[PDB]
């Protein structure tokens, strides 16, 4: 089975983006969905929507890229350069509000799970809560 569903989703996205896929499906979970919301709001994906593959629930993630480029290797710049799982099963990472990181001096985000819900670094620091550090994206 999947040991880390969230890591698996992040990876699906990474792999899909690298070959410039139009979209990609990931097995559906409310958690994954709540992550994808933040992801969309912050503008790393065009958006997501719920679909049914076979008889089972999935989330289509519509990825997003830059404009076609010049010179050799016309392939566009990635909107998601880096997406990485931080807290994993078997080592879990919890941070206090003073310990919340700052990704790429603001140019990136980090997604936290707090008791006030799934938030970004800005959002969490604003509501003044820490939580599990899920991943970092930039």
């Amino acid at each position: 089975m999947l040991t880390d569903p969230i890591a698996d989703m992040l990876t699906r996205i990474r792999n899909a983006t690298r070959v410039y896929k139009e979209s990609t499906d990931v097995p559906a979970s409310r958690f994954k969905e709540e992550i994808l919301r933040i992801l969309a709001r912050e503008g790393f994906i065009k958006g997501y929507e719920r679909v049914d593959v076979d008889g089972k629930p999935y989330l289509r993630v519509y990825l997003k890229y830059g404009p076609r480029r010049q010179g050799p290797d016309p392939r566009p710049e990635q909107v998601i350069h880096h997406i990485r799982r931080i807290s994993k099963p078997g080592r879990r990472v919890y941070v206090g509000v003073k310990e919340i990181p700052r990704v790429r001096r603001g140019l990136g985000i980090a997604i936290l799970s707090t008791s006030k819900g799934v938030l970004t670094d800005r959002e969490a620091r604003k509501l003044g809560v820490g939580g599990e550090l899920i991943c970092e994206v930039w």
Binding site: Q70, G71, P72, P74, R75
Partner: protein, 235 residues
């Protein structure tokens, strides 16, 4: 500037194998173990392509016509000979773009020796020279024929088979020279800046596309030249 249903032979692609998966978007379906190019998408990209061509043309930019494919070998040497455009026919010498100065030195030697066979000096020095220089001029005209017209790097290139000519394409991209091409199922679309998704094999398709292209050129620069004399090369 017509096309539409007048495309005959174009939608025929290469075999089931030999393809490039990246071309999947430009494919309609697979008939008789043959990929068949999408009918509409062809015109779709044709618009944008010919628009770029028109703009570049009325601006006065030169286009380098390129193919060796031996199906398209005869077509290019006339179609490009129309208007002012240079062409590469026999083979693509490595560095024609990136090494362009050095290659141009050969053009200088070409018109040099033409000027030698002009003046009285043909019969000067032994037949040892007269036999050599003659063959030198021979091969120089064999290769650099259409290339002699370029005094400076082109503003775009036109390529018949981007897979076969892929070196030309490569240094075009290198020098940021916009690539126009006629792409078949066996080619990588991403390398082509303006794509014409059709058969690169049949003489009919090449004739149609290139002829209409030059027609668009001269139409952009005015004068509206008579219909192209490539139609007798259908053999």
């Amino acid at each position: 500037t017509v096309k539409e249903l007048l495309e005959a032979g174009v939608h025929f692609g290469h075999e089931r194998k030999r393809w490039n998966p990246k071309f999947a978007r430009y494919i309609y379906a697979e008939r008789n173990g043959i990929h068949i190019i999408d009918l509409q998408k062809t015109m779709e990209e044709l618009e944008r392509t010919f628009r770029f061509i028109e703009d570049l043309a009325m601006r006065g930019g030169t286009i380098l016509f390129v193919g060796t494919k031996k199906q398209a070998q005869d077509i290019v040497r006339m179609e490009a000979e129309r208007a002012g455009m240079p062409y590469v026919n026999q083979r693509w010498l490595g560095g024609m773009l990136t090494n362009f100065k050095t290659i141009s030195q050969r053009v200088h030697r070409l018109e040099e020796l033409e000027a030698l066979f002009a003046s009285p000096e043909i019969e000067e020095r032994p037949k040892k020279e007269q036999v050599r220089l003659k063959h030198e001029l021979e091969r120089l005209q064999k290769y650099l024929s259409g290339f002699r017209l370029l005094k400076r790097l082109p503003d775009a290139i036109f390529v018949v088979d981007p897979t076969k000519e892929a070196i030309a394409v490569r240094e075009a991209r290198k020098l940021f020279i916009p690539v126009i091409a006629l792409a078949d199922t066996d080619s990588d679309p991403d390398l082509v800046d303006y794509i014409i998704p059709g058969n690169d094999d049949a003489i009919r398709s090449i004739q149609l596309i290139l002829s209409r292209a030059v027609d668009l050129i001269i139409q952009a620069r005015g004068g509206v030249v008579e219909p192209s004399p490539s139609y007798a090369l259908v053999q």
